[PDB]
Structure 1
């Protein structure tokens, strides 16, 4: 089986995940919502950007009532940004959970504060997408976030051309365990080649052991032939997630330049002496757990 150090590593990651992933989104509050009764190549790029990831929004009340928001079609105007303030609040809530996740890991808190900042900058979106996938319903095409749900709107082959959507469907198909998800989070978090990382050697050694632990876990708990090459598939998915991260960052900067919507914590993570430019990140890392 697994070595006792690998067992302890998985248990610490899983403990951290449980403590910092509010999978019922019960503490996501005070978010913005679309109002009730509401250069050319750059706009053309932005309009193609937003239409790819088009979702409707549903809020179930504690009483059993339901509010449902259907987004407008693109009529060439500011109507395509109606959901961005809400998405900024949701992404910000997710990022805070990801920050708390890293803070609980012993190997992360032992790193210098500037490397903690640079790793969180490099990995925050990726870790958020990994968590979002665990609440993704591939049959209904909806992310189920507690009383909130985000449903992709109607074909499906065309939708899969959007890399972010293809990633979520492909990753869901692997039917990963919680332990495999959290090891993916650690491999992405401890990436030695993120910009600004000074302790690249210690990070690379850490990433290698998380990858070794993931491979050993898969060999210990998945005898079926449906899971052949599963470790390599997961590592390829992580490489793909890194590519999607870069495309998404460019997409956000294009939208933010035309229609600013990013919260102050997002502006820090996307870059819109390391500690001076990241007062919020610095603060959250000092507050501890």
Structure 2
């Protein structure tokens, strides 16, 4: 009592395609990130490990924004609304992209093909264990579920169209854009595993888990401010960190969306 229409199949296809072509621009930008570095007496190696992660996050933001521009309907919405959606979804989509790059055999996370990181390396880059353990506890929970590229792409699309985000002008338009992607996930999962009906509610529930992970990310940024760690404008604006850029006066996410 389920069907994946030709229209839904072609929609899912564009999502996987968009995701892969964004990864292409993301892989080109690899020589831009400061290299991962015995630490000198100056203390610069720590600054280098922090900047590495910072620049990888910037690459990850640019990828999300280019993916949303390619998710049908998103560019129809008002600029205020699309900024409001990506601001809240960034960290959620960021953790989703971290989880699919988790290797259970090595217990490591691989970014941009070459950069492989363990729980220690995440700590060395300035992150706290209160954020590291949930990152790896979610990564290995995403693995148990064992998603494909179509499932990841649909879940990212559903996450973007969460009407409840702060400063969403037209919640009605956003809730309307979400439902076709939700029915496409229901159909795809039921056609993928005809025997396991629990696949789809298990996927939707991961969006609830992402909400806690955002809350845990906020605790990490609060800690970064104690540590006098300076986030670049783009990250400061998306996550409301520093006075100036945190006010959105810089209008980066806006300029990024414009072109």
The answer to whether TM tops 0.5 is yes
Deviates more, 1:144-153 or 1:235-244: 144-153
Residue 148 of structure 1 corresponds to which residue in structure 2? 115
Distance (whole Å) between structure 1 residues aligned to residue 250 and residue 8 of structure 2:
34
Residue 63 of structure 2 corresponds to which residue in structure 1? 97
Q: What does 1:185-224 correspond to in 2, within 5 Å?
A: 185-224=156-195
Deviations 1:153-183 (A, max 9, x none): 49xxx99993222111000111111110001
Which ranges of structure 1 fall in alignment gaps of 5 or more residues? 39-76
3-state SS of 1:121 partner: helix
Aligned length: 243
**Cα RMSD for the two superposed structures:** 2.9
Residue 181 in 1 paired to residue 152 in 2? yes
Distance (whole Å) between structure 1 residues aligned to residue 239 and residue 93 of structure 2:
14
Asked if 1 retains the 8 angstrom alpha-carbon contact of 2:81 and 2:168, the reply is yes
Residues 122 and 175 (structure 1 numbering): CA distance in 2 closer, same or farther, change over 3 Å?
same
Residue 258 of structure 2 corresponds to which residue in structure 1? 286
Residue 119 in 1 paired to residue 119 in 2? no
Residue 12 in 1 paired to residue 14 in 2? yes
Distance (whole Å) between structure 2 residues aligned to residue 188 and residue 279 of structure 1:
23
Residues 271 and 24 (structure 1 numbering): CA distance in 2 closer, same or farther, change over 3 Å?
closer
Residue 30 in 1 paired to residue 32 in 2? yes
Distance (whole Å) between structure 1 residues aligned to residue 215 and residue 131 of structure 2:
18
Higher relative contact order (CA 8 A, sep 6+): 1
Distance (whole Å) between structure 2 residues aligned to residue 83 and residue 256 of structure 1:
17
> Is the helix fraction higher in 1 or 2?
2
Which ranges of structure 2 fall in alignment gaps of 5 or more residues? 122-128
Residue 237 of structure 1 corresponds to which residue in structure 2? 206
- The alpha carbon displacement at 1:149 in A equals 1.0
Residue 172 of structure 1 corresponds to which residue in structure 2? 143
Residues 179 and 213 (structure 1 numbering): CA distance in 2 closer, same or farther, change over 3 Å?
same
> Is the strand fraction higher in 1 or 2?
1
Distance (whole Å) between structure 2 residues aligned to residue 95 and residue 24 of structure 1:
10
- The alpha carbon displacement at 1:138 in A equals 1.4
